[PDB]
Amino acid sequence: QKRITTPYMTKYERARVLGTRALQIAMCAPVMVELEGETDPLLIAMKELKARKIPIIIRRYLPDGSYEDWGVDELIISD
Amino acid sequence: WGDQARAGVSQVLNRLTFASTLSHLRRLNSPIGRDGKLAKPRQ
Amino acid sequence: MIYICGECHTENEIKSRDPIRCRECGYRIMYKKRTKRLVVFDAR
């Protein structure tokens, strides 16, 4: 509640979330979406992002010090 | 040249092409510092 | 270990500790001969 930041997902949050998810899945994390034969963890993480199933909460830091906890499934995907 | 006065006067001869050897033997070098941004003696 | 003199082009048979010195003409430039193993050169 009381969220004032942009609901859209910026290009920099798309870079870090996909980077963190690809590193996690390569470390034998449970894949959250059914796969049709993908092996490269980047392509798996893209499939997780397009299916809105990435278990990552983005914490955005406002300048005054307060922070807002946004889950990736709650943001509009720019792609 | 002393014994800090001058430096880089004697060079190893650029023995790569006969045109390069002749060009190196007939070379003139100016004493203006290459860190000077002036352009009056370069034109 | 035989060397070719730079002036007279004669063998010298210099050992490991023998100073560089021609036995015939007295010259101090030596060239090693080509090795006995044969190297294949492609014609390309």
Binding site: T6, Y8, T10, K11, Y12, E13, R60, S78 | - | -
Partner: protein, 184 residues
């Protein structure tokens, strides 16, 4: 709308920079819906007015219901809502563009999607982006009434040199001295 732009633009230079290309995505709506400009349309002019009013409320730059926030929101998207009301007016849509009801609904949705995609993303280092963009076209001018203009002018302008090289004024005449060479 017109009187505000007369204050903002005194020189009449109407070539401005705005995110959504209104004159082109209208042409997109004509071609994707196969709109015939000869036949009369079926688009209600009051539906245009309510559509533009709803679209203007749906594009937010300064978010908040505060009166200070609402004033900043109106001023931030002022020039875009000038262009949106001018291009999507009832007269031009009924005479020149001739968009239909379904084409107008697609156009309003696509403007909102394009404007929200053009918002500056938080976290972007615009300071380093600006000075790269302001120093890259500093390698494409020639150095030195004569006037300092180029790299020496740029070097002087960002140093704030207390003694210039060629200082100058541009004095304008107010009364009859402007129209007469004798009093000038």
């Amino acid at each position: 709308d017109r009187e505000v732009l007369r204050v903002i633009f005194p020189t009449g230079d109407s070539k401005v920079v705005l995110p959504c290309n209104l004159l082109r995505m209208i042409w997109n709506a004509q071609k994707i819906f196969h709109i015939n400009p000869r036949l009369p349309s079926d688009l209600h002019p009051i539906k245009v007015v309510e559509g533009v009013k709803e679209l203007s409320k749906k594009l937010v730059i300064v978010n908040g219901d505060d009166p200070l926030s609402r004033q900043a929101q109106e001023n931030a998207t002022l020039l875009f809502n000038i262009h949106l009301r001018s291009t999507l007016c009832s007269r031009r849509m009924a005479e020149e563009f001739r968009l239909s009801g379904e084409a107008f609904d697609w156009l309003l949705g696509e403007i909102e999607s394009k404007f929200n995609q053009a918002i500056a993303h938080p976290g972007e280092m615009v300071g380093a982006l600006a000075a790269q963009s302001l120093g890259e076209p500093a390698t494409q001018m020639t150095l030195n009434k004569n006037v300092t203009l180029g790299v020496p002018r740029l070097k002087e302008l960002i140093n704030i040199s207390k003694k210039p090289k060629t200082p100058s004024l541009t004095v304008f005449l107010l009364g009859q001295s402007a129209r007469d060479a004798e009093r000038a």
